[PDB]
Design a protein around this nucleic acid. Structure first.
Ligand code: SF4
Ligand SMILES: [Zn+2]
Lengths: 49, 80, 49, 74, 49
DNA sequence: GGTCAGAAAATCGGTTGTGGTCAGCTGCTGCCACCGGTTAACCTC
DNA sequence: GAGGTTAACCGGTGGCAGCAGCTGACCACAACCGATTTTCTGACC
């Protein structure tokens, strides 16, 4: 889930609107993800309830 | 010590580039004569012809907004 | 204190150093040109090396 | 990275009005380009004057005297 | 592919093959350089033997 | 044998204008994915 | 001996991409004119 474990491309939100480095740390209400690097898939934790 | 290509031989980029856009017909005459020693005046002149330059010295030749000039008239009344 | 070294190995070993030096001697004006010159093994690389 | 630095140097070799015109035209300062009349509005002249300045500046950049350092960056 | 009898050296092309890489997004700086130089978009990627 | 004055450049800058072209927007056009009802196939009350 | 059952097949929905027609933003260019400003020439006599 990209909404939990970050995006899959560098500063690429999921719908595709925000694709610029001027956007940074901005969660996108349409797709759900926060714009950042794809390196955060190395160290973003999730939990099961 | 360089052993590079003919870029210092290339008299386009020897000095100041703004000289090549001189706002004085005399002031660009040195620029136009400087490409008399240019190895590549044919292809450069051809490229400037086909790309429809708006300005400047090109192939050892100035260009108007559309095409080739003999040489620009200066400010004032043209003579007889 | 000395040891030998074959040139086809040492050229591969010292490749970024020789890239920097033969850019600084203007034998190749950019890094990609330096890399292609090293790959084609033009004779100036030994006197640089 | 060296391309970005060389681009900054050559962009700063020309004067500030056309420099900021190119920067706003291509988003080299923010990541977002502007319309021609938007740049004309934020500078102070009409968009056609802006277009003339832009075209002649693009030709000046296209000239080999400034394209020497960017001839083979592709 | 090369002709029969053509003497080769290190790293030369033996088979010329180029792959359809699709189209990716463009950096504005690459856009400016492509506008300056006037070249093909080069929508395919080379993988040559 | 000086002397304003006019004509005519160019040069930066508006202007108009207009024409087109394309980004996109969006209601039809039509096809495409679940959902389940039914219809001829298996085991012997 | 069809009763009851059964995998698959056979109507019947909502989703989505297309998609062609319709805006308006926005540029191309094109002239085109408009102050500016030199500056040369042109009669006065
Ligand atoms: S304008 Fe003339 S001198 Fe300058 S680079 Fe082109 S051909 Fe050479
Ligand atoms: Zn999104």
């Amino acid at each position: 889930c990209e909404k939990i474990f970050g995006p899959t491309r560098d500063w690429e939100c999921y719908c595709g609107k925000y694709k610029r480095v001027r956007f940074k740390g901005i969660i996108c209400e349409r797709c759900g993800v926060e714009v950042t690097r794809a390196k955060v898939r190395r160290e973003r934790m999730g939990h099961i309830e | 010590q360089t052993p590079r290509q003919r870029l210092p031989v290339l008299p386009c980029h020897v000095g100041d580039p703004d000289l090549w856009f001189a706002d004085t017909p005399a002031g660009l005459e040195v620029a136009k004569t400087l490409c008399v020693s240019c190895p590549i005046r044919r292809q450069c002149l051809a490229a400037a012809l086909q790309r429809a330059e708006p300005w400047g010295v090109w192939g050892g030749e100035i260009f108007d907004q559309g095409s080739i000039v003999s040489h620009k008239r200066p400010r004032g009344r043209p003579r007889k | 204190h000395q040891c030998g070294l074959p040139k086809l190995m040492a050229l591969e070993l010292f490749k970024p150093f020789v890239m920097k030096r033969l850019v600084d001697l203007n034998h190749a004006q950019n890094i990609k040109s330096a890399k292609r010159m090293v790959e084609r093994q033009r004779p100036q690389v030994w006197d640089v090396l | 990275t060296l391309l970005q630095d060389q681009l900054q140097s050559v962009l700063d070799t020309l004067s500030e009005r056309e420099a900021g015109v190119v920067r706003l035209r291509f988003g080299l300062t923010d990541g977002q380009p502007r319309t021609l009349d938007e740049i004309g509005q934020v500078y102070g002249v009409t968009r056609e004057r802006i277009r003339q300045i832009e075209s002649k500046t693009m030709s000046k950049l296209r000239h080999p005297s400034r394209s020497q350092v960017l001839r083979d960056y592709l | 592919i090369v002709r029969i009898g053509a003497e080769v050296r290190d790293g030369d092309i033996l088979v010329g093959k180029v792959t359809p890489k699709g189209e990716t997004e463009l950096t504005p700086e690459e856009r400016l350089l492509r506008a300056i130089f006037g070249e093909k978009a080069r929508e395919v990627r080379d993988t040559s033997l």
